[PDB]
Amino acid sequence: SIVAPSISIPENQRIPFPKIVGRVVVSDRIPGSKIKLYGKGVDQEPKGIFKINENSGEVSVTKALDREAIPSYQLQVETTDENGKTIEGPVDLEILVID
Ligand SMILES: [Zn+2]
Numbered sequence: 846s847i848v849a850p851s852i853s854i855p856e857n858q859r860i861p862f863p864k865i866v867g868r869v870v871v872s873d874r875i876p877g878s879k880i881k882l883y884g885k886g887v888d889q890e891p892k893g894i895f896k897i898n899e900n901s902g903e904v905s906v907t908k909a910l911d912r913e914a915i916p917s918y919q920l921q922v923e924t925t926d927e928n929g930k931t932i933e934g935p936v937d938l939e940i941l942v943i944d
Pocket of ligand 1: 943
């Protein structure tokens with residue numbers, strides 16, 4: 846299955862970016878299936894704020910966040926085969942921007 850623990854990121858982080866801020870773990874995971882991340886903050890506006898290493902499942906933020914602008918994000922994570930076809934998923938990844 847997929848484990849996607851919730852992340853809290855303080856607003857106003859300093860460089861450098863990107864910063865790893867968590868990882869998704871499957872563990873009993875398929876060769877060489879990939880972990881995919883989607884949603885507002887990734888491939889829907891605002892685009893490119895978060896990304897995932899499709900192998901390690903480490904999630905990274907790409908810039909400093911402002912809690913007053915968006916105080917939280919809710920993304921979807923899944924595992925795919927080499928062809929991006931869904932195996933496991935989706936499951937929420939919640940990201941809270943803390944004061
Ligand atoms: Zn503050």
